[PDB]
Amino acid sequence: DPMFIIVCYDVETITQEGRARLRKVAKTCESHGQRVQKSVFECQLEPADYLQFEAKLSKIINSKTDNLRIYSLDAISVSKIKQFGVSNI
Amino acid sequence: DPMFIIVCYDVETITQEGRARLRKVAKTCESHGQRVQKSVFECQLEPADYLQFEAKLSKIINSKTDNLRIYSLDAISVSKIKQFGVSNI
């Protein structure tokens, strides 16, 4: 029943403004899941809550600069997640 | 019949060696799909070819330094894939 969501956020983290945008997206995602890369998060949601969550992240980015890509997958979509190398940050 | 594959490669791009590792992953993924973000690619492969592909990416990375994450999905609707902002390289 619960949706599995991969959030991929490409934003510059040289400027304080850009670091703050990434911090804000991280903090939205981490109350529904886990940070797996600097800018990749895995979340679980009831489908009912999805749209509000999508709007929340959307509103945070600079749409003239940044890229946000969200995969909203059915539970059964995913057969295998394979990790390589090192797991911190 | 073929699997949908999200490749997420988190590598430092401060050193020439690190930029080169990202370039080499990109070039492997782009003969099987599309670069959709700086460090995210979408690929399609028949199962037999998956393992050889997974080994090829694995071999390229610094396993002590980089993070490579491969999602193996059953085929999804394009409607499950949401984008916001621009594609700026």
Residue numbers in the entry:
A (entry chain A), B (entry chain B): -1 to 87
Publication excerpt:
The genome of pathogenic Leptospira interrogans serovars (Copenhageni and Lai) are predicted to have CRISPR-Cas of subtypes I-B and I-C. Cas2, one of the core Cas proteins, has a crucial role in adaptive defense against foreign nucleic acids. The Cas2 proteins (80–120 residues) are core metallonucleases found universally in all CRISPR-bearing taxa. In Leptospira, the CRISPR-Cas subtype I-C lacks the CRISPR array component and is thus considered an orphan CRISPR-Cas system. Unlike Cas2 from other organisms, the purified rLinCas2C and rLinCas2C_Lai exhibited metal-dependent DNase and metal-independent RNase activity.
The crystal structure of rLinCas2C obtained at the resolution of 2.60 Å revealed the protein is in apostate conformation and contains N- (1–71 amino acids) and C-terminal (72–90 amino acids) regions, with the former possessing a ferredoxin fold. The crystal structure of rLinCas2C encloses the signature N-terminal ferredoxin domain (βαββαβ). LinCas2C crystal is composed of a total of three α-helices (α1–α3) and five anti-parallel β-strands (β1–β5) for the Cas2 orthologs enlisted in Table 2. In rLinCas2C, upon dimerization, the buried surface area is 3,430 Å2, identified by PDBePISA. A total of 33 hydrogen bonds were formed between two protomers of LinCas2C as analyzed by Coot. The rLinCas2C dimer demonstrates that the β5 strand (6 residues) of one protomer bridges with the β4 strand (5 residues) of another protomer by 8–10 hydrogen bonds and several other residues enlisted in Supplementary Table S2. The crystal structure of rLinCas2C (dimeric form) indicates it is in a catalytically inactive conformational state as the distance between the conserved Asp8 residue of each protomer is 11.0 Å (as opposed to 6.5 Å in SsoCas2). The distance of 11.0 Å seems too far to coordinate a single Mg2+ ion of the protein. For these aspartates to bind a bridging metal, the rLinCas2C would need to undergo either a major conformational change of the β1 or ferredoxin fold region or altogether the dimer orientation. The mapping of the surface electrostatic potential of rLinCas2C demonstrated the presence of a positive charge at the putative nucleic acid substrate-binding loop (L1 and L2) and the α1 region. In LinCas2C, alanine replacement mutation of conserved residues Tyr7, Asp8, Arg33, and Phe39 and loop L2 abolishes DNase activity, whereas moderate reduction of RNase activity was evident in selected mutants.
